[PDB]
Design a protein around this ligand. Sequence first.
Ligand SMILES: CC(C)Nc1nc2ccc(C(=O)Nc3cnn(C)c3)cc2[nH]1
Lengths: 156, 39
Amino acid sequence: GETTDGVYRVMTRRLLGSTQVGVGVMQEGVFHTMWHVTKGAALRSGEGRLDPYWGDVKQDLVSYCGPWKLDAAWDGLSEVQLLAVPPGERAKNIQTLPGIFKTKDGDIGAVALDYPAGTSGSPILDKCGRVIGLYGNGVVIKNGSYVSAITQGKRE
Amino acid sequence: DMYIERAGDITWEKDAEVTGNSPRLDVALDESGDFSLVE
Ligand SMILES: CC(C)Nc1nc2ccc(C(=O)Nc3cnn(C)c3)cc2[nH]1
């Protein structure tokens, strides 16, 4: 069905009413979201079907209809925008300077914005509007707030 | 059955709400894709 580039909501009619489980990005005919949103299950777009193509539970990412297309990276210096798509609320851009997640395998950018779990999959953008990652996989800090990593896949 | 609905264009918006801090956190990623605080 709908194949236009842009940000989309991922919904389900399995629970009470219509519930938003997450968000995703459509780009170059490929739908990109986080694994914990769909659990790798197939999606419906109008009257069409989107089948998974690639996924990895450790990276917490999944791509539909084709391989991962998003290849932009945070430069380690500039502020970025979280194009948040919250449940039952309109798309809203929020600008912030990312922090860092120091791991044994390298540093990763991290946005200190807190949004419901239904917001998972919302894109994070650079100055030219390119998608540098997805929001939704992070940690709960001392003061109870959520801090998400900037999660980016690999483009082959 | 999960379904998708369009929510908007992906663009940088000038003069957006500027909020949020920049913390440097020591973390670990487990085999199931879960992050945890290392202190
Ligand atoms: C702290 C609270 C007030 N807010 C809060 N925003 C959240 C966003 C995502 C998740 C979440 O569960 N993610 C995940 C990524 N991978 N998996 C398996 C599960 C939790 C959140 N909590």
